[PDB]
Write a protein that binds this ligand. Sequence first.
Ligand SMILES: Nc1ncnc2c1ncn2[C@H]1C[C@H](O)[C@@H](COP(=O)(O)OP(=O)(O)OP(=O)(O)O)O1
Ligand SMILES: [Mn+2]
Ligand SMILES: [Mn+2]
Ligand SMILES: [Zn+2]
Length: 384
Amino acid sequence: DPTELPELLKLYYRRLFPYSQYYRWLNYGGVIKNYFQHREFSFTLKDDIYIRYQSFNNQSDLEKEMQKMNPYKIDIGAVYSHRPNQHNTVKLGAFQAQEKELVFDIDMTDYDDVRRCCSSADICPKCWTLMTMAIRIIDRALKEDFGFKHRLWVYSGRRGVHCWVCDESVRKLSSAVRSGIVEYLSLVKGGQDVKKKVHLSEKIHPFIRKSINIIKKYFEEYALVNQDILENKESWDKILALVPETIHDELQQSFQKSHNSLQRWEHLKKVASRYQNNIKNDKYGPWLEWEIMLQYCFPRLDINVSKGINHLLKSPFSVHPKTGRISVPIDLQKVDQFDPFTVPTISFICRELDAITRDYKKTSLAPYVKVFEHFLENLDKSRK
Ligand SMILES: Nc1ncnc2c1ncn2[C@H]1C[C@H](O)[C@@H](COP(=O)(O)OP(=O)(O)OP(=O)(O)O)O1
Ligand SMILES: [Mn+2]
Ligand SMILES: [Mn+2]
Ligand SMILES: [Zn+2]
């Protein structure tokens, strides 16, 4: 019921929202003129009403407007050529997005075809490991393959995670280059009319090998125990749909003679590595095994979020109105331990604040601000 939110939001924006850390972030050291003043913010108010092209002069101005409007959620957009809140006085064609963080949005709902426990916006500990693998796979590539140093991972508050890549030269990337980065990171392709969504080449690129090796660390506990993807014929038929027909019968017989998913996976790998893809040559390998693991575990991005320079994205420390959860930074050093269900709601921290220094340090929000500050300290070091 979003009728209790206004009272809780007013307290949150008055005593708990981390304004000074937030401004340290988006002011980026104050080195570039008008960088914060030219940032678009988009507030959502009651009744799904929202406003585009809000912008503020400084931290005090942001605080006062957030505390005046108490928005249900806050989205961050690009840095523009002029003040967004003056964009109607700008000659046509001159008001232009110029810079923005490279962002990623990952939605558990995009995995429904390979999730057995949950569907739609639901999540649980048995499928959250998909996000753990997505963070590790994507973050490794952003850090090691692209050399991006300033990466803020955030729980979106309901069904997934965000990443904000904030390096100086990343923020200037064109939409076309952003799109190229997405394609580099993408392997799972196809809608609901495409049964087999992953096709690998004979020689696998090191990004693919390294991503497979990450999944291999999690696959037994995630796919074979928690999801039990080969529990019975209803489940293992979905996997047989991803391999050549000419081995279904052999695998059916092995599955029926095995006791559990662990044993049945071992048989699939043995058979798959004996399949002859090209009768021309005598070359064999684990391509099928890899294509299955990738289809079930490899990150699926909400790609349109990443391609557009102008694209809004929900802010860190925004409330998610549908759950009350605060969109909190994720401690990269404890990603395996992240529990979305310990993430505090706005109701929970407002209760803590006044249960028997009146700021977020009295509440469960404090450790999440600490992660944010570590990210901000690295940005500070990078500028001196
Ligand atoms: N009406 C809209 N106008 C502009 N941008 C929007 C709108 N709706 C969604 N978006 C963009 C910005 C959002 O931050 C982004 C992600 O949407 P979505 O994944 O559904 O929510 P979310 O990532 O904030 O939380 P969650 O996925 O956990 O529910 O898409
Ligand atoms: Mn999302
Ligand atoms: Mn989305
Ligand atoms: Zn689940």
